[PDB]
Design an enzyme around this catalytic site. Structure first.
Site, PDB file in Angstrom:
ATOM      1  N   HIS A  11       0.810  -1.230   0.000  1.00 44.97           N
ATOM      2  CA  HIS A  11       0.000   0.000   0.000  1.00 44.97           C
ATOM      3  C   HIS A  11       0.827   1.256   0.000  1.00 44.97           C
ATOM      4  O   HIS A  11       0.379   2.266  -0.584  1.00 44.97           O
ATOM      5  CB  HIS A  11      -1.103   0.076   1.071  1.00 44.97           C
ATOM      6  CG  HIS A  11      -0.631  -0.129   2.475  1.00 44.97           C
ATOM      7  ND1 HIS A  11      -0.655  -1.370   3.075  1.00 44.97           N
ATOM      8  CD2 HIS A  11      -0.191   0.739   3.417  1.00 44.97           C
ATOM      9  CE1 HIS A  11      -0.215  -1.261   4.317  1.00 44.97           C
ATOM     10  NE2 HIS A  11       0.069   0.007   4.552  1.00 44.97           N
ATOM     11  N   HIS A  64       6.331   7.051   6.036  1.00 48.94           N
ATOM     12  CA  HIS A  64       5.817   6.629   4.757  1.00 48.94           C
ATOM     13  C   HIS A  64       5.118   7.823   4.164  1.00 48.94           C
ATOM     14  O   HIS A  64       4.957   8.844   4.821  1.00 48.94           O
ATOM     15  CB  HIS A  64       4.813   5.488   4.917  1.00 48.94           C
ATOM     16  CG  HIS A  64       3.624   5.859   5.750  1.00 48.94           C
ATOM     17  ND1 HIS A  64       3.644   5.794   7.127  1.00 48.94           N
ATOM     18  CD2 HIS A  64       2.431   6.411   5.413  1.00 48.94           C
ATOM     19  CE1 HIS A  64       2.488   6.234   7.603  1.00 48.94           C
ATOM     20  NE2 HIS A  64       1.727   6.606   6.578  1.00 48.94           N
ATOM     21  N   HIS A 123       4.208  11.075   6.510  1.00 49.74           N
ATOM     22  CA  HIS A 123       3.779  10.790   7.857  1.00 49.74           C
ATOM     23  C   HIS A 123       4.932  10.180   8.613  1.00 49.74           C
ATOM     24  O   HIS A 123       5.382   9.081   8.246  1.00 49.74           O
ATOM     25  CB  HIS A 123       2.593   9.819   7.807  1.00 49.74           C
ATOM     26  CG  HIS A 123       1.325  10.485   7.337  1.00 49.74           C
ATOM     27  ND1 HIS A 123       0.242   9.784   6.845  1.00 49.74           N
ATOM     28  CD2 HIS A 123       0.980  11.791   7.278  1.00 49.74           C
ATOM     29  CE1 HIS A 123      -0.716  10.622   6.513  1.00 49.74           C
ATOM     30  NE2 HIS A 123      -0.304  11.851   6.761  1.00 49.74           N
ATOM     31  N   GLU A 146      -3.492  13.604   2.147  1.00 52.61           N
ATOM     32  CA  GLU A 146      -4.627  13.111   2.911  1.00 52.61           C
ATOM     33  C   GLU A 146      -5.291  14.281   3.643  1.00 52.61           C
ATOM     34  O   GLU A 146      -6.478  14.558   3.430  1.00 52.61           O
ATOM     35  CB  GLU A 146      -4.115  12.081   3.889  1.00 52.61           C
ATOM     36  CG  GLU A 146      -3.675  10.788   3.129  1.00 52.61           C
ATOM     37  CD  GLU A 146      -3.731   9.534   3.982  1.00 52.61           C
ATOM     38  OE1 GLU A 146      -3.235   9.551   5.125  1.00 52.61           O
ATOM     39  OE2 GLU A 146      -4.233   8.490   3.501  1.00 52.61           O
ATOM     40  N   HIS A 204       1.906   9.231   1.311  1.00 53.44           N
ATOM     41  CA  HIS A 204       0.730   8.994   0.488  1.00 53.44           C
ATOM     42  C   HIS A 204       0.826   9.961  -0.712  1.00 53.44           C
ATOM     43  O   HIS A 204       1.240  11.140  -0.539  1.00 53.44           O
ATOM     44  CB  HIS A 204      -0.523   9.342   1.282  1.00 53.44           C
ATOM     45  CG  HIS A 204      -0.653   8.595   2.574  1.00 53.44           C
ATOM     46  ND1 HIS A 204      -1.378   7.427   2.677  1.00 53.44           N
ATOM     47  CD2 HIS A 204      -0.125   8.822   3.800  1.00 53.44           C
ATOM     48  CE1 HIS A 204      -1.354   7.006   3.935  1.00 53.44           C
ATOM     49  NE2 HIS A 204      -0.584   7.824   4.635  1.00 53.44           N
ATOM     50  N   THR A 213      -4.605   6.538   9.274  1.00 52.11           N
ATOM     51  CA  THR A 213      -5.409   6.701   8.054  1.00 52.11           C
ATOM     52  C   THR A 213      -5.490   5.441   7.184  1.00 52.11           C
ATOM     53  O   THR A 213      -6.105   5.467   6.118  1.00 52.11           O
ATOM     54  CB  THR A 213      -4.900   7.875   7.182  1.00 52.11           C
ATOM     55  OG1 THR A 213      -3.612   7.528   6.644  1.00 52.11           O
ATOM     56  CG2 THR A 213      -4.877   9.186   7.996  1.00 52.11           C
ATOM     57  N   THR A 214      -4.877   4.346   7.632  1.00 55.79           N
ATOM     58  CA  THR A 214      -5.055   3.038   6.984  1.00 55.79           C
ATOM     59  C   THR A 214      -5.683   2.083   7.974  1.00 55.79           C
ATOM     60  O   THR A 214      -5.453   2.205   9.181  1.00 55.79           O
ATOM     61  CB  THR A 214      -3.673   2.445   6.563  1.00 55.79           C
ATOM     62  OG1 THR A 214      -2.759   2.547   7.668  1.00 55.79           O
ATOM     63  CG2 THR A 214      -3.103   3.202   5.369  1.00 55.79           C
TER      64      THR A 214
HETATM   65 ZN   LIG Z   1       0.031   7.732   6.538  1.00 60.78          ZN
END
Ligand SMILES: [Zn+2]
Ligand SMILES: N[C@@H](Cc1c[nH]c2ccccc12)C(=O)O
Length: 256
Positions: free
Chosen positions: A61, A91, A116, A103, A93, A195-196
């Protein structure tokens, strides 16, 4: 399992993870004219001089840069936080296009990507115990816009071809996350969630106002990563962002 597509993406997550419709979900839109300056916030302390990176992992992901968190080496404290939070991984996004990918949004504005830096509260002994606590985690969120290259990102970009597909990892020692920070530490803060999946409501979010710039060539290399495993057909790793969720009467505070 869960993902970012039509059939398994954010609109579906609530079925396996009912907390997706919870009271403190992330990300949120940051409405700058509703956020209030908070004189009670202590200055933020980002102490990454002794950070010890170990490995970079494509988890199907995103990609995680992992740190040795078995001693106080890379810590976040101050601002809205009580005590010490240790960095465990970072990581990103990002989008398929420069116009989307972050995000959090700022007055509805989406950035090209968002970093993040994930930290856990050292009063809970480890990450797994921390994510069972309402103050277990602190995530430092940093927006990325496309412009000038970020030199401190290039070691990450250049290792990506070695972890193209789900489950691949590479040694990633001596990476200095100080090279990913903007000049200013002005920030917004609010209580939220991972957020995952499993979307745990354990995060004090600290979102910096100042984005970093990264080059078109840098973000293009992010977009060459794959969601699929080696041996499976190609599914470009793009648009791995959850959209803004209901604020539900939480208050976002400004440090400035
Ligand atoms: Zn994140
Ligand atoms: N094993 C996970 C994190 C984790 C899951 N359960 C835990 C319990 C304790 C400490 C860490 C964990 C990782 O780093 O990928």
């Amino acid at each position: 399992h869960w993902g970012y597509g039509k059939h398994n993406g954010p609109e579906h997550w609530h079925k396996d993870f009912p907390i997706a419709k919870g009271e403190r979900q992330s990300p949120v839109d940051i409405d700058t004219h509703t956020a209030k300056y908070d004189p009670s916030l202590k200055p933020l302390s980002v102490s990454y001089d002794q950070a010890t990176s170990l490995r970079i992992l494509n988890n199907g992901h995103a990609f995680n840069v992992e740190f040795d968190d078995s001693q106080d080496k890379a810590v976040l404290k101050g601002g809205p936080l009580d005590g010490t939070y240790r960095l465990i991984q970072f990581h990103f996004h990002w989008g398929s296009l420069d116009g989307q990918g972050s995000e959090h949004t700022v007055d509805k504005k989406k950035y090209a990507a968002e970093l993040h830096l994930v930290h856990w509260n050292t009063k809970y002994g480890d990450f797994g115990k921390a994510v069972q606590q309402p103050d277990g985690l602190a995530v430092l969120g940093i927006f990325l816009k496309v412009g000038s290259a970020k030199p401190g990102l290039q070691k990450v970009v250049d290792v990506l071809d070695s972890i193209k597909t789900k489950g691949k990892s590479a040694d990633f020692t001596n990476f200095d996350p100080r090279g990913l920070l903007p000049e200013s530490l002005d920030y917004w803060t609010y209580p939220g969630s991972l957020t995952t999946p499993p979307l745990l409501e354990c995060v004090t979010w600290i979102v910096l106002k100042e984005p970093i710039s990264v080059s078109s060539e840098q973000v293009l290399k992010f977009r060459k990563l794959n969601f699929n495993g080696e041996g499976e057909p190609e599914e470009l790793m793009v648009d791995n962002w959850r959209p803004a969720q209901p604020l539900k009467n939480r208050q976002i505070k400004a440090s400035f």
